[PDB]
């Protein structure tokens, strides 16, 4: 005839178990994040303690003493990506991927800066050109300046 620790208080958060917890005696709690990354935890708990567990997508398990092991689906709770705003609702996609979006966005921020400076050169060089053939003769009667319109001011001709 043997031990048993009082049941936990399960509390939901986004991919996270808050657990206000309150034992009778020192209880060894422990878990197993079921990824091939185990990332287990152990701690004897005698003092009541609200704890936390970063649950992953595939699952975690939970062992309140010799009370049987629990298990938990924590998929999303940050609301995916509905859309009626410009971009502050994309946080939903960030809150589900706060590892790949930080780099995936900075990637998206990077390539536009790539596409910026390449557009700088392949506009300003090509804006420096098409006036060097034109603004060196300086009469230059061609009203097809209307292709750059960043290097400007013809001679009324």
């Amino acid at each position: 005839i043997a031990t048993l620790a009082p049941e936990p208080l399960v509390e939901h958060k986004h991919r996270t178990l808050i657990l206000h917890l309150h034992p009778d005696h020192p209880t060894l709690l422990t878990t197993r994040s079921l990824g091939s990354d185990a990332n287990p935890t152990r701690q004897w708990i005698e003092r009541p303690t609200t704890v936390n567990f970063t649950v992953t997508g595939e699952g975690l398990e939970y062992t309140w003493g010799n009370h049987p092991p629990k298990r938990v689906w924590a998929q999303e709770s940050g609301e995916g990506n509905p859309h009626g705003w410009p971009h502050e609702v994309v946080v939903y996609y960030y809150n589900r991927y706060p590892l790949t979006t930080i780099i995936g966005l900075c990637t998206c921020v990077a390539i536009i800066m790539v596409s910026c400076v390449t557009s700088v050169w392949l506009l300003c060089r090509t804006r420096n050109l098409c006036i060097t053939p034109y603004k060196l003769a300086p009469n230059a009667q061609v009203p097809i300046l209307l292709a750059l319109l960043c290097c400007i001011k013809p001679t009324r001709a």
């Binding site: 399960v10 924590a74 995916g80 506009l123």
Partner: protein, 430 residues
């Protein structure tokens, strides 16, 4: 029709593939790997347990020496002692006063708990994994058979012949060296038989419980009894089995990776969900229905009605079934995007019947093969609210465009604008 299928290793969920035999009616699978018990190849290297200094009763020669000999008992510590005056029930009894000799001897022996409460080392190799695969097949509706993984083993239990694995995910959660205790299994680098430092784990090291021989490095050091009284100072480290029960490490069923459970039973590591298994079955052709007897369902329509962007089968979709005959129609999404609860749907003459499913992409564009009739059940899904219960049926997460398509096409448009600015300079140039 020997339906080869790569198949994710994950225990508690069916895998309802579809037999696309050219010529007769297709048949659904329902392959639920109910268990993944492993049973690697191992070797009992030595039991350990806490010692018991079961002292043999010392000699007391009253006037002169008694030389001791090194008896072959395990860790037979024996040291002669003089200079006693042993008070035994009548005051002392040996009439000399320095020639009073006392020979203490003590050897190490397995506890009585060693038989029953005992750690247990192992050299652990890989062995061969198993499973009680249920298939509630087709119209067979049942077989719950124990199988193997090695990719030529059939198991003709039921009517179907099925070949499994070998799996690609060779992570034995057991390490090479393992200690085992009752049920808590420790992937511990036990030192070895024959060596274990006293106090450290394996101070006692018996091959098995029966084995009278052992290795007892306990640092058992006898000291002389005090002030002319009969007793046996045995100065000794309490066992490395005493510790290892309260300064130990945590168990592999509480620290393993990739999702395993454990037993002191054939030394399996159950339900290790990792990787895929190339599974292939030879169905009984009798179980097939010929193609000309199931209703042809084409000229249909499918649409979600309340898609739940989730794990539990919250996704639903009516299907405007357009049948020819009336009867059953096995179903499956050959795309892994959608996992469906219903293997089979009954059909009247061109009715409509919703099924349940689950997905992972906001816009589930998954085909649905209603007994040789494909259809896209395109739509959009909703996130849930209530995520704290056991494991999913979805298991299909992948890459899941509202600011990417014309965004990056627009990103490209800047650099696409380049070489149509450049080389048009070549034209203005000529």
């Amino acid at each position: 029709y020997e339906h080869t299928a790569v198949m994710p290793n994950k225990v508690g969920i069916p895998y309802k593939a579809l037999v696309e035999r050219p010529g007769y009616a297709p048949v659904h699978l329902q392959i639920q790997l109910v268990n993944t018990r492993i049973i690697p190849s191992t070797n009992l290297e030595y039991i350990t347990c806490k010692y018991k200094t079961k002292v043999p009763s010392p000699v007391v020669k009253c006037c002169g020496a008694t030389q001791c000999t090194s008896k072959p008992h395990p860790d037979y510590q024996c040291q002669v002692f003089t200079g006693v005056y042993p008070f035994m029930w009548g005051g002392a009894y040996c009439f000399c006063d320095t020639e009073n000799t006392q020979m203490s001897e003590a050897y190490v022996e397995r506890s009585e708990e060693c038989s029953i409460d005992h750690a247990k080392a192992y050299k652990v190799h890989t062995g061969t994994v198993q499973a009680m695969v249920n298939i509630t097949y087709g119209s067979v509706s049942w077989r719950s058979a124990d199988v193997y993984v090695n990719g030529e083993t059939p198991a003709k239990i039921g009517d179907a012949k099925l070949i499994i694995g070998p799996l690609s995910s060779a992570w034995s959660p057991f390490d090479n060296k393992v200690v085992v205790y009752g049920h808590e299994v420790y992937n511990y680098d036990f030192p070895e038989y024959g060596t274990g430092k006293a106090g450290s784990f394996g101070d006692l090291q018996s091959r098995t419980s029966t084995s009278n021989d052992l290795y007892a490095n306990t640092n058992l050091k006898l000291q002389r009894p005090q002030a002319g009284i009969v007793h046996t100072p045995f100065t000794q480290a309490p066992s490395g089995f005493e510790r290892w029960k309260r300064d130990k490490g945590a168990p592999l069923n509480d620290v393993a990776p990739f999702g395993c459970s454990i037993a002191l039973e054939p030394l399996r590591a159950e339900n290790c969900a990792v990787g895929s298994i190339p599974i292939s079955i030879d169905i009984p052709d009798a179980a097939f229905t010929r193609i000309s007897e199931t209703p042809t369902v084409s000229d249909l329509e499918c649409k979600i009605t309340e898609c739940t962007y989730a794990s539990d089968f919250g996704g639903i979709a009516t299907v405007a079934y357009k049948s020819s005959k009336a009867g059953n129609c096995p179903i499956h999404s050959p795309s892994g995007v959608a996992v469906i609860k219903e293997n089979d749907v009954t059909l009247a003459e061109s009715g409509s019947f919703t099924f349940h499913f689950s997905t992972a992409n906001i816009h589930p564009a998954f085909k649905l093969q209603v007994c040789t009739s494909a259809v896209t059940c395109k739509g959009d899904c909703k996130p849930p609210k209530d995520h704290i219960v056991d494991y999913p049926a979805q298991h299909t997460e992948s890459f899941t465009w509202s600011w990417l398509k014309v965004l990056v096409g627009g990103t490209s448009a800047f650099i696409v604008l380049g070489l149509i600015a450049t080389a048009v300079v070549a034209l203005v140039l000529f």
